[PDB]
Design a binder for this molecule. Sequence first.
Ligand SMILES: C[C@H]1CC[C@@H](O)[C@H]1NC(=O)[C@H](Cc1ccccc1)C[C@H](O)CN1CCN(C(=O)c2cnc(N3CCN(C)CC3)c(Cl)n2)C[C@H]1C(=O)NC(C)(C)C
Lengths: 99, 99
Amino acid sequence: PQITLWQRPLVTIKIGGQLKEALLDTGADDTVLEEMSLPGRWKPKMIGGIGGFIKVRQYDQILIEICGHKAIGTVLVGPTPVNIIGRNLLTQIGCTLNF
Amino acid sequence: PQITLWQRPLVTIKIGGQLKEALLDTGADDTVLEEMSLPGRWKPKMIGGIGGFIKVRQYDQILIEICGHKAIGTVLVGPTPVNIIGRNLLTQIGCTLNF
Ligand SMILES: C[C@H]1CC[C@@H](O)[C@H]1NC(=O)[C@H](Cc1ccccc1)C[C@H](O)CN1CCN(C(=O)c2cnc(N3CCN(C)CC3)c(Cl)n2)C[C@H]1C(=O)NC(C)(C)C
C-alpha cells in the first residue's frame, strides 16, 4: 500500500497472538515494542535517541506479521512510549521511501 | 527518488547556505536540527522521544532544501543525536511509504 505522512503511519502488526498497532519508523534502526513476554532468552541492551537512553530486552529471531507480510528479526522489548517498527523489519516487507 | 532502508536514509540538506547530513524520519512528527544559528525569535517547545522529553527552540518559516526540494517550515533546535527531518517537512516534498 501507499502510506501518506499527513498522519502518523500506524499499521496493525501481529506478534505473539496479540494484535498491536505500531509506527513505521524509517529513522529507527531497531524495532522496539512495549513491555510484553516473548519466548526465548534475552540479552540486555541500551538504546537511545532524543530524551536519552532506555534499557530493553533483546529477543532474536521473532516473527512479526506487518499488515499481512511476515517478517523475522530482532525485537527489543521495553518501556517505549509507542510500538515502533524499524529498518531491520521494514526491509523484509519491501518498504521504500519515495518522493 | 526511491530509497531502500538497508542503510540509514541520510540525505543532504541545505540550510543557511550550509550543507548538512539529515535523517529522513517518518517516525518524527517534527524536524529537529542540531545546535545552530537561525534567524528571528523563537518559542519554547517540549518534545518527547524514546528516552524522555527535552526542551528545544522553535523557529518558524525557515527555508531548507532537502535533496533539491525546497521547503519552508518549522524547525526545532536542540540536543539531538543527528539532524532529523520529520513528517512536517516530508509532506511538503511529497514523501510516502510504499510496500
Ligand atoms: C522526533 C521526535 C519528536 C517527537 C516524536 O515524533 C519524536 N520521534 C521520535 O523520537 C521517535 C520515537 C517516538 C515516536 C512517537 C512518539 C514518541 C517517540 C524515534 C525516532 O523516529 C528515531 N530516532 C532518530 C534519532 N536517533 C539516532 O539518530 C540514534 C542513532 N544511533 C545512536 N547510536 C547508538 C549506537 N552507536 C554505535 C551509534 C549511535 C543513537 Cl544514540 N541515536 C534515535 C532514533 C530512535 O529513537 N531509535 C530507536 C531505535 C531508539 C527507536
